[PDB]
Amino acid sequence: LQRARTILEFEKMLPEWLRSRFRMGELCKVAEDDFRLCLRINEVKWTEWKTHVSFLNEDPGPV
Amino acid sequence: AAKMGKAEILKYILSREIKEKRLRSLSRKFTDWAYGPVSSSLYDLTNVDTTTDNSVLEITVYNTNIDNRHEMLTLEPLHTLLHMKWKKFAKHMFFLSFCFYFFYNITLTLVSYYR
Amino acid sequence: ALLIAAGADVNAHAKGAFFNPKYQHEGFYFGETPLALAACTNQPEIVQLLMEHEQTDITSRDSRGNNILHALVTVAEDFKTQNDFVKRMYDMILLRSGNWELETTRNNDGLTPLQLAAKMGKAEILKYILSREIKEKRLRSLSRKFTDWAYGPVSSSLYDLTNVDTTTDNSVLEITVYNTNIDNRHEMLTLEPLHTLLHMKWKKFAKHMFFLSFCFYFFYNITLTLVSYYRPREEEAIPHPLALTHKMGWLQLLGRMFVLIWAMCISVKEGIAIFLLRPSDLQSILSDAWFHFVFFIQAVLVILSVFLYLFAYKEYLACLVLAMALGWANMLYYTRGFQSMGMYSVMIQKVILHDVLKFLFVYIVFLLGFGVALASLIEKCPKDNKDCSSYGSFSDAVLELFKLTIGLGDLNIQQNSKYPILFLFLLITYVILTFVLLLNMLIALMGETVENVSKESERIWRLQRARTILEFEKMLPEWLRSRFRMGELCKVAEDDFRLCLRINEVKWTEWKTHVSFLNEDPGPV
Amino acid sequence: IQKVILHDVLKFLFVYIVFLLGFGVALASLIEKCPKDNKDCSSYGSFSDAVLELFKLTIGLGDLNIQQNSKYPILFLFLLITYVILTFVLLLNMLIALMGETVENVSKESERIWR
Numbered sequence: 001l002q003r004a005r006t007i008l009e010f011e012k013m014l015p016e017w018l019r020s021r022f023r024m025g026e027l028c029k030v031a032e033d034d035f036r037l038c039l040r041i042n043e044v045k046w047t048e049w050k051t052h053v054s055f056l057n058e059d060p061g062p063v
Numbered sequence: 064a065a066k067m068g069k070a071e072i073l074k075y076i077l078s079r080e081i082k083e084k085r086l087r088s089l090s091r092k093f094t095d096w097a098y099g100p101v102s103s104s105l106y107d108l109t110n111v112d113t114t115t116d117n118s119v120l121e122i123t124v125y126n127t128n129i130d131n132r133h134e135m136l137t138l139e140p141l142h143t144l145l146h147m148k149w150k151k152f153a154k155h156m157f158f159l160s161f162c163f164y165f166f167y168n169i170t171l172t173l174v175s176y177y178r
Numbered sequence: 179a180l181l182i183a184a185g186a187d188v189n190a191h192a193k194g195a196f197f198n199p200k201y202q203h204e205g206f207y208f209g210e211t212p213l214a215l216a217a218c219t220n221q222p223e224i225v226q227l228l229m230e231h232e233q234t235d236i237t238s239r240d241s242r243g244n245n246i247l248h249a250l251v252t253v254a255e256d257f258k259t260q261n262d263f264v265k266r267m268y269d270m271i272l273l274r275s276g277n278w279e280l281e282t283t284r285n286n287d288g289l290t291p292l293q294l295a296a297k298m299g300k301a302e303i304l305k306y307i308l309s310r311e312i313k314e315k316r317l318r319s320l321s322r323k324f325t326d327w328a329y330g331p332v333s334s335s336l337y338d339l340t341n342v343d344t345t346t347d348n349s350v351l352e353i354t355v356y357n358t359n360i361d362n363r364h365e366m367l368t369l370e371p372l373h374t375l376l377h378m379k380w381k382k383f384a385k386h387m388f389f390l391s392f393c394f395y396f397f398y399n400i401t402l403t404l405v406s407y408y409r410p411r412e413e414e415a416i417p418h419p420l421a422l423t424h425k426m427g428w429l430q431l432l433g434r435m436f437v438l439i440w441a442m443c444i445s446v447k448e449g450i451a452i453f454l455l456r457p458s459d460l461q462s463i464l465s466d467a468w469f470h471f472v473f474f475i476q477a478v479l480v481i482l483s484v485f486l487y488l489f490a491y492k493e494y495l496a497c498l499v500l501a502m503a504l505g506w507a508n509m510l511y512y513t514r515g516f517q518s519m520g521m522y523s524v525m526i527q528k529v530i531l532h533d534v535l536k537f538l539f540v541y542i543v544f545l546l547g548f549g550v551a552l553a554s555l556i557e558k559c560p561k562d563n564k565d566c567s568s569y570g571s572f573s574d575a576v577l578e579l580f581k582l583t584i585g586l587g588d589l590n591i592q593q594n595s596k597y598p599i600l601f602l603f604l605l606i607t608y609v610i611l612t613f614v615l616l617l618n619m620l621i622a623l624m625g626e627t628v629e630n631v632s633k634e635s636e637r638i639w640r641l642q643r644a645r646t647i648l649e650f651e652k653m654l655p656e657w658l659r660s661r662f663r664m665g666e667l668c669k670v671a672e673d674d675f676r677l678c679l680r681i682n683e684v685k686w687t688e689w690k691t692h693v694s695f696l697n698e699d700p701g702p703v
Numbered sequence: 704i705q706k707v708i709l710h711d712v713l714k715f716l717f718v719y720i721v722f723l724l725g726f727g728v729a730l731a732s733l734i735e736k737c738p739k740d741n742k743d744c745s746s747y748g749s750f751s752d753a754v755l756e757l758f759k760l761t762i763g764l765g766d767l768n769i770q771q772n773s774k775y776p777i778l779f780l781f782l783l784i785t786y787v788i789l790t791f792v793l794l795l796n797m798l799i800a801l802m803g804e805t806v807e808n809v810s811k812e813s814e815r816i817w818r
């Protein structure tokens with residue numbers, strides 16, 4: 001929490017051009033004509049197996 | 064929800080999955096790909112990151128009226144978002160602020176002690 | 179089932195980069211084969227169907243050299259993470275095969291599935307293999323645990339020691355003790371065949387060698403002491419200690435020879451030892467090699483002294499005094515023959531790294547900060563009295579503040595300062611931070627350290643002790659290694675003579691009819 | 704009282720003495736002969752003298768002068784402060800912490816052992 005306060009106070013100081021390049025997330029197409037900025041996080045889950053029916057890309061892995 | 068301190072409702076919204084296609088666009092969590100136990104999720108950052116004026120992240124850190132902030136930054140989209148801001152610019156600035164303030168005190172010392 | 183019936187290749191090899199990642203969170207490895215995916219994904223019905231198919235090469239290897247059993251060790255995890263299904267797939271595929279071909283196969287790195295499990299740190303899979311019972315006669319030769327005899331609740335088991343004992347190059351025991359890449363070694367030596375195997379090496383040769391290594395190193399320090407403390411201080415010490423000079427005397431001569439030899443002996447040994455493990459990370463040397471450096475340092479400081487005696491400047495004495503103070507404080511190493519003093523030594527190590535170094539750092543920022551602040555106020559002393567103050571300089575103030583913290587000396591507030599109430603303010607401020615808060619806070623944080631570490635100090639002790647036993651064992655010659663060889667040769671099956679380890683047990687809970695055994699006449703002989 | 708001696712003190716006293724006598728002879732070995740002008744040039748002039756003075760420091764009694772007619776003063780300070788860190792900072796305070804573990808476990812049985 002204290003560390004988070006330090007990060008944001010630094011972040012409020014940066015200029016506009018330097019704020020843009022360190023912008024977070026990548027632009028993804030989550031639906032039809034719905035381009036949003038999102039955050040990629042990987043997970044590994046072993047317990048409740050299932051058939052993966054809902055997804056965005058059938059070719060897994062990066063790129 | 065971030066202001067009044069309702070972590071359970073936040074954890075629902077910030078990681079909402081609607082598996083029902085024909086209502087999948089109403090989600091904020093999206094499974095990009097999954098092969099076996101490995102999966103990759105996408106968390107929307109519309110009004111969570113500080114690109115806007117009053118974001119969820121800014122309320123969480125600066126809300127002095129609640130007493131459960133340190134549970135909120137455990138939530139996955141925020142937690143990962145803090146770690147990345149550190150790796151890129153906040154870590155280096157924290158080292159610089161140290162150095163300027165470190166040599167600042169050494170100068171006060173020596174002009175005084177060797178007056 | 180349709181695709182296999184239609185002629186689908188049941189021995190494909192998905193060898194792509196996604197199927198051979200380099201960072202877990204880059205992809206998913208399973209062994210590249212359809213049988214391994216069904217096993218690594220908990221699909222027992224498909225795993226059975228593929229084995230029954232007659233072209234399924236269960237003994238197939240992959241790019242990493244891993245067969246079906248190597249891959250299950252790769253994807254296994256602890257019970258809270260997954261479940262016990264990897265252990266159950268491990269059993270199902272091994273029994274259906276019906277031979278030792280799979281567990282004997284070595285990967286490209288030269289490792290069996292048993293050795294691979296000890297390296298990567300999969301205790302649950304080890305505990306299964308190292309104590310495997312197949313009660314089904316017609317598959318009993320595929321076991322590693324054998325019931326020699328049982329009469330009622332008393333039973334006697336035999337544990338195979340094929341590639342567990344150090345008779346071979348890369349054994350399970352050697353991986354367990356020397357694997358600096360994992361963080362659960364002290365759980366591994368709890369497993370019964372290893373645990374009993376450590377205890378017996380101690381009873382036979384490692385205990386006695388530990389007593390001898392003590393004695394040689396004990397008289398080594400006494401000799402360094404007396405040649406130094408009783409040196410010829412007068413004459414400006416031209417006949418330096420450790421000289422091998424004027425005539426003789428049988429204590430003067432014997433002692434000085436034994437030191438310079440044993441000094442080199444550590445330096446070569448620890449010179450080799452420090453080089454082999456090749457310090458990679460920082461947690462290893464502290465947790466596996468700390469006492470190896472101090473003896474390297476202690477030995478080199480002697481030899482550094484033995485050069486500087488008759489060859490160079492007069493700082494030989496400083497190197498010799500460090501050698502003994504280092505030498506005598508090191509003796510906490512040899513506490514580890516005893517459990518009580520050994521566990522006590524483990525806690526000294528932890529409390530320094532968790533509490534003291536945090537403490538000493540913060541204390542010094544105060545000690546030097548308040549020091550220069552208090553020294554900066556002291557006027558020049560009048561020429562009448564030169565000793566007007568004890569804070570007259572930085573080094574003087576830092577020392578006096580140190581004296582206060584340890585409770586030594588006296589404290590006069592009149593120190594020829596320009597601002598006395600301000601002078602008192604910084605002093606009493608220093609007391610509150612140091613005397614009231616930090617010192618007493620240090621005691622409280624130790625209690626938290628002792629509480630958490632007390633539940634693990636016994637098993638960490640046996641780990642350090644295990645390292646001592648094996649290092650002794652690597653020194654012994656061949657003929658002396660053979661007589662202290664472990665296990666007895668037993669006939670566990672037809673034309674299968676193996677070396678095993680006899681351990682007796684008493685079990686009262688789940689009674690049964692003892693049907694599987696080796697000898698119907700119980701008891702020894 | 705009976706338990707805490709056998710579980711904590713005898714472990715403690717053993718390790719403390721290996722330091723007390725080891726650092727003692729090391730510090731005594733450095734002290735030159737006193738000039739004939741001042742016979743009492745040092746308090747570490749011998750083994751028994753140094754072992755006593757180090758004992759005094761641990762119990763907080765007396766004074767401490769660093770000028771002791773040594774050949775190597777920074778080296779002389781190094782062994783002394785080293786002795787303080789092991790004894791004053793670590794072992795004494797560590798002893799209190801190990802008692803708390805002894806009191807916790809034994810408190811559940813002291814009544815029945817009393818009877």
Ligand SMILES: CCCCCCCC/C=C/CCCCCCCC(=O)O[C@@H](COC(=O)CCCCCCCCCCCCCCC)COP(=O)([O-])OCC[N+](C)(C)C
Pocket residue numbers: 009010013014015018151152155156157159160163
């Ligand atoms: C392209 C280069 C940069 C261009 C120029 C951009 C200039 C941006 C201007 C920033 C503000 C400048 C004025 C100082 C503000 C006053 C506050 C003060 O006294 O201390 C400041 C000193 O700490 C700093 O970090 C400031 C130094 C400049 C930041 C480094 C450049 C930007 C990040 C580069 C990326 C590196 C990674 C790159 C990786 C590829 C803040 O410290 P504090 O601790 O927050 O405040 C102290 C009080 N407190 C502790 C109570 C809170």
Ligand SMILES: CCCCCCCC/C=C/CCCCCCCC(=O)O[C@@H](COC(=O)CCCCCCCCCCCCCCC)COP(=O)([O-])OCC[N+](C)(C)C
Pocket residue numbers: 382383386387388390391394443444447469470473511649650653654655658
């Ligand atoms: C048959 C008699 C023997 C025949 C000859 C065989 C010669 C074998 C040769 C062994 C090595 C000899 C050279 C020394 C190695 C260099 C290292 C050193 O200086 O210290 C060594 C001294 O500790 C010892 O134990 C070595 C002394 C000889 C061992 C006793 C004979 C073998 C056991 C007899 C059977 C007994 C039971 C009998 C019951 C029936 C090792 O100590 P350390 O503590 O490991 O190392 C210090 C550093 N460390 C703390 C950081 C690790």
Ligand SMILES: CCCCCCCC/C=C/CCCCCCCC(=O)O[C@@H](COC(=O)CCCCCCCCCCCCCCC)COP(=O)([O-])OCC[N+](C)(C)C
Pocket residue numbers: 172173176177538539542543546547550571572573574576
């Ligand atoms: C390790 C983690 C902790 C990090 C925190 C770092 C601290 C951060 C904050 C620091 C606060 C700032 C203080 C220093 C700046 C002012 C100094 C100055 O003005 O000049 C002095 C330079 O210093 C010396 O000459 C040193 C002499 C020895 C005394 C100090 C030793 C204490 C070390 C600690 C013990 C363990 C050390 C272990 C490592 C070696 C001049 O010295 P003087 O006295 O005027 O000498 C001449 C006069 N005389 C003839 C009377 C002698």
Ligand SMILES: CCCCCCCC/C=C/CCCCCCCC(=O)O[C@@H](COC(=O)CCCCCCCCCCCCCCC)COP(=O)([O-])OCC[N+](C)(C)C
Pocket residue numbers: 596597598599600601603
């Ligand atoms: C003891 C205090 C109470 C203890 C309780 C602790 C809690 C209170 C803590 C208080 C902190 C400091 C207390 C210092 C004590 C007095 C020292 C003093 O008077 O020194 C000298 C004055 O010199 C000074 O420096 C006077 C104090 C300056 C201001 C301190 C507070 C910061 C305000 C800054 C503004 C920013 C803040 C704005 C708001 C955001 C005089 O003293 P002397 O020389 O000994 O007197 C003899 C007379 N003689 C000179 C003729 C010889």
Ligand SMILES: CCCCCCCC/C=C/CCCCCCCC(=O)O[C@@H](COC(=O)CCCCCCCCCCCCCCC)COP(=O)([O-])OCC[N+](C)(C)C
Pocket residue numbers: 403404407408506716717720721722724725728749750751752754
């Ligand atoms: C028990 C469990 C712990 C074991 C740890 C083992 C230790 C390991 C580490 C050991 C470090 C090595 C130190 C000893 C070797 C060097 C000595 C030397 O050079 O000669 C000295 C021999 O010693 C004496 O004469 C002793 C005199 C009394 C002082 C010591 C008593 C304190 C014992 C502890 C208290 C409790 C004892 C309880 C049991 C009795 C010469 O003495 P001196 O001073 O020159 O005397 C003559 C000069 N004078 C006229 C100035 C006086």
Ligand SMILES: CCCCCCCC/C=C/CCCCCCCC(=O)O[C@@H](COC(=O)CCCCCCCCCCCCCCC)COP(=O)([O-])OCC[N+](C)(C)C
Pocket residue numbers: 716719720723751752754755758761762
């Ligand atoms: C962490 C807190 C502390 C922890 C506790 C452990 C502390 C360990 C530390 C202990 C004390 C250390 C200092 C002792 C050495 C100084 C001796 C000395 O100079 O005085 C005398 C000699 O005395 C000897 O020669 C000493 C004999 C051995 C010690 C016997 C008592 C041991 C304790 C027993 C009780 C407990 C036993 C347990 C069961 C009850 C004479 O001195 P002098 O005449 O002035 O000058 C010398 C000249 N002369 C020799 C020529 C005459």
Ligand SMILES: CCCCCCCC/C=C/CCCCCCCC(=O)O[C@@H](COC(=O)CCCCCCCCCCCCCCC)COP(=O)([O-])OCC[N+](C)(C)C
Pocket residue numbers: 474475478479493496497500774775776777778779781
């Ligand atoms: C204080 C240190 C920092 C504290 C932080 C702790 C961390 C650092 C700990 C460091 C450990 C020891 C520090 C001793 C302090 C200096 C003492 C000194 O210089 O004494 C003397 C030199 O005599 C010596 O002995 C010099 C040091 C020898 C080497 C020590 C390290 C081992 C390296 C061995 C190789 C093996 C390893 C190889 C790699 C595997 C000189 O000092 P003096 O006489 O007082 O000066 C006055 C000048 N006069 C002589 C003209 C009168």
Ligand SMILES: CCCCCCCC/C=C\CCCCCCCC(=O)O[C@@H](COC(=O)CCCCCCCCCCCCCCC)COP(=O)([O-])OCC[N+](C)(C)C
Pocket residue numbers: 400401402404405408429430432433434
């Ligand atoms: C328990 C904790 C402490 C242990 C420390 C050891 C005990 C205390 C140690 C010593 C007694 C101190 C009193 C003075 C007598 C010294 C005699 C001597 O040999 O001196 C020579 C050194 O000799 C050597 O370096 C030879 C090395 C092997 C024998 C060492 C003797 C002790 C061994 C067994 C020790 C038992 C250990 C336990 C055994 C299992 C040189 O000195 P000196 O000039 O000839 O000496 C007379 C000087 N005087 C006339 C001024 C007095």
Ligand SMILES: CCCCCCCC/C=C\CCCCCCCC(=O)O[C@@H](COC(=O)CCCCCCCCCCCCCCC)COP(=O)([O-])OCC[N+](C)(C)C
Pocket residue numbers: 463464465466468475500503504507508510511523524526527528530531785
């Ligand atoms: C030549 C200089 C000699 C000076 C001293 C001579 C007099 C003798 C004085 C001291 C030696 C006696 C003390 C040790 C006692 C046994 C060990 C023990 O109790 O636990 C620990 C001691 O803790 C440390 O080692 C922490 C690091 C600083 C120690 C300072 C003293 C020695 C090094 C001086 C600096 C030199 C640096 C110079 C550059 C090389 C074991 O060490 P660790 O591995 O850190 O802990 C593992 C923790 N773990 C359980 C989580 C894994």
Ligand SMILES: CCCCCCCC/C=C\CCCCCCCC(=O)O[C@@H](COC(=O)CCCCCCCCCCCCCCC)COP(=O)([O-])OCC[N+](C)(C)C
Pocket residue numbers: 380385388389392509510512513514515516517518519721
């Ligand atoms: C100078 C500083 C010296 C260095 C530190 C020395 C340490 C302090 C000294 C003693 C501490 C005593 C504490 C009580 C021990 C009980 C617990 C235990 O493990 O018992 C074992 C002791 O029996 C053995 O045979 C093992 C030890 C023998 C080798 C030690 C030689 C070197 C140390 C010699 C030192 C003596 C000279 C000391 C004075 C110089 C029982 O046997 P085991 O085979 O381990 O079986 C375990 C069974 N159990 C777990 C069910 C019980």
Ligand SMILES: CCCCCCCC/C=C\CCCCCCCC(=O)O[C@@H](COC(=O)CCCCCCCCCCCCCCC)COP(=O)([O-])OCC[N+](C)(C)C
Pocket residue numbers: 517518519521709710713714716717
């Ligand atoms: C300064 C002046 C005096 C010198 C001080 C030197 C002091 C050192 C002297 C000598 C060396 C001893 C060092 C300490 C060893 C560890 C203790 C130990 O094992 O305690 C155990 C208690 O259970 C016991 O059985 C301990 C009793 C054995 C010793 C009896 C006294 C004899 C030694 C002389 C001492 C008495 C006479 C006093 C004077 C010497 C606790 O260990 P644990 O890990 O909990 O496990 C134990 C078994 N368990 C698993 C079943 C629970």
Ligand SMILES: CCCCCCCC/C=C\CCCCCCCC(=O)O[C@@H](COC(=O)CCCCCCCCCCCCCCC)COP(=O)([O-])OCC[N+](C)(C)C
Pocket residue numbers: 460531532534535536538539542
């Ligand atoms: C007065 C004269 C001497 C100066 C005194 C000043 C001393 C300070 C000097 C220097 C600055 C260091 C300050 C302390 C840092 C924090 C400690 C820390 O992280 O502890 C951690 C373990 O311990 C370590 O992680 C430290 C071990 C690595 C460093 C090895 C020693 C080198 C530094 C020099 C020191 C050795 C030589 C000694 C002499 C310098 C415990 O933290 P945790 O929260 O449990 O989490 C850890 C990770 N975990 C989550 C996996 C568990």
Ligand code: NA
Pocket residue numbers: 584585586762763764
């Ligand atoms: Na005191």
Ligand code: NA
Pocket residue numbers: 584585586762763764
């Ligand atoms: Na005191």
Ligand code: NA
Pocket residue numbers: 585586587763764765
């Ligand atoms: Na006092």
Ligand code: NA
Pocket residue numbers: 625803
């Ligand atoms: Na407690």
